[PDB]
Every structure is written in structure tokens, then in C-alpha cells.
């Protein structure tokens, strides 16, 4: 069937893994389990098309950038994740977007900006900021809670449709 290689990138601890588990295994981790590189493959139906998501859950460890490039070079679509309560992770979003474009040799590669943890109250990144940033990239912005599963399906599915339209 159709295969979509989706890549989840972001700063350490933003919720990359929790978002992916919530999509696939319908539960919230709530647990310290730092990724190195994990892969998930799952047959879905999106808008009536049977497809397979091959999802690569990367790490935010700085020590691991080359491995990230190698796996990132495969991606069709990318979720660039920060946490709405961690300004640094929002700041690091620019470095991920650029590493992605060098590694993909493209400026318009499919991509969603994801503001995770919108269940939290200690918001330090206002939504208007990320909207502007996602506007300047010509990519969508979607807020997620991996805890409450809100926006999770939205964000992946929107990437899938970004990819089909490319
Ligand atoms: N409140 C809340 N906490 C979340 C959410 N998503 C993840 N967390 C919490 O934040 C921590 C990090 O989650 P994790 O998925 O491991 O992040 P990561 O980006 O994959 N980490 P790494 O880069 O090291 O692999 C965990 O304690 C997790 O439960 C969310 O949507 N809401
Ligand atoms: Mg992880």
C-alpha cells in the first residue's frame, strides 16, 4: 500500500515519543524514557485511503545529530515539535527546520509546526507567536496534548495530506 515516511523531530523531552505512542497505542506515557531512535509502522485509513505510516521517532539529544540526519534524509513529512511551556524548545525549532532543509535539499518539504502539551497551564509560548512562525514557513501550526490526545490525530493526518498535495 501507500507508505508515508513521517519523522518526528524536536528538542529533548518536548513529547515527540508521547505523541507517537498516543496515536498508535492510544495511551499517554507519562514517563521518562528518552529516545535514541524508534520506528513504528501502522496500517491506517485516512480519508478512505488505506496507507501505512512508517514513523521515525527521533531523539532531541545534541550528541546524536548525524544519526538524526541519516534518518531525517528519508522523511517525506516532518513534525517539528516544541512544548508550549518550554521557550528554549520553541527557540530550537529554527535549528531543526534548517537542518531538515539542508538534509532534504528543499525549502517546501511537507511539515507541521506542533506546539505540544497544550494541556499544561504554564504556557510560556503564546499561540500567536507560533502561528506567525508557521505563517513565515508556509506550513500549518497545530497545538497538541499527548496527555489528552487532543490535536494528535489532527497533526499527523494533516502532515499526510501535506504530503499528498506536495
Ligand atoms: N502534560 C503533558 N506532558 C507531556 C505531553 N507529552 C509528553 N509529556 C511529558 O513530557 C516528557 C517527555 O516526553 P517524551 O515523549 O519522552 O519526549 P521526547 O520528545 O520523546 N523526548 P526525547 O527527545 O528525549 O526522546 C514525559 O514525561 C511525558 O510524559 C503532553 O502532551 N502533555
Ligand atoms: Mg522520545
- Rounded CA-CA distance 112/88 in Å is 18
Provide the 10 A C-beta neighbour count for residue 137.
Answer: 18
- In 3D, which of 120, 114, 164 has the Cα closest to residue 139? 114
Helix (H) or strand (E) holding 42: strand 38-46
Out of 11, 18, 71, give the residue to mutate to test ligand 1, the one with the largest number of ligand atoms within 8 Å of its CB.
18
Q: How many domains does the chain have?
A: 1
Burial label, 48 (beta-carbon count in 10 A; 0-12, 13-18, 19+): exposed
Experimental determination approach used: X-ray
CATH number at 68 reads 3.40.50.300
Neighbours of 87 (CB within 10 A): 13
- How far apart, in whole angstroms, are the C-alpha atoms of residue 141 and residue 97? 14
- Which positions ≥6 away from 58 have C-beta within 8 Å? 7, 8, 9, 10, 16, 35, 37, 68, 71, 72
| Containing structural domain, residue 156 | 2-165
Whole-angstrom distance, CA of residue 101 vs CA of residue 72: 10
Q: Determine the Cα–Cα distance for residues 113 and 116; give it in Å rounded to an integer.
A: 10
DSSP structural state of residue 108? S
Distance CA 75, CA 55 (A): 9
Among 7, 9, 17, which residue has the most ligand 1 atoms within 8 Å of its CB, making it the best to mutate? Answer: 17
> Of 30, 80, 40, whose CA–CA distance to 60 is shortest?
80
Question: Is there a contact between 136 and 142 (Cβ–Cβ < 8 Å)?
Answer: no
Amino acid at each position: 500500500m501507500t507508505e508515508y515516511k513521517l519523522v518526528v523531530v524536536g528538542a529533548g523531552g518536548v513529547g515527540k515519543s508521547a505523541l507517537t505512542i498516543q496515536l498508535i497505542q492510544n495511551h499517554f506515557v507519562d514517563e521518562y524514557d528518552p529516545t535514541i531512535e524508534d520506528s513504528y509502522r501502522k496500517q491506517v485509513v485516512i480519508d478512505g485511503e488505506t496507507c501505512l505510516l512508517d514513523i521515525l521517532d527521533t531523539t532531541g539529544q545534541e550528541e546524536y545529530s548525524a544519526m538524526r540526519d541519516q534518518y531525517m534524509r528519508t522523511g517525506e513529512g516532518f513534525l517539528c515539535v516544541f512544548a508550549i511551556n518550554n521557550t528554549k524548545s520553541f527557540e530550537d525549532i529554527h535549528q531543526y527546520r534548517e537542518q531538515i532543509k539542508r538534509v532534504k535539499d528543499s525549502d517546501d518539504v511537507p511539515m507541521v509546526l506542533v506546539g505540544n502539551k497544550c494541556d499544561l497551564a504554564a504556557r510560556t509560548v503564546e499561540s500567536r507567536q507560533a502561528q506567525d512562525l508557521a505563517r513565515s514557513y508556509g506550513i500549518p501550526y497545530i497545538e497538541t496534548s499527548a496527555k489528552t490526545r487532543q490535536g494528535v490525530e489532527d497533526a499527523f493526518y494533516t502532515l499526510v495530506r501535506e504530503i499528498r498535495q506536495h
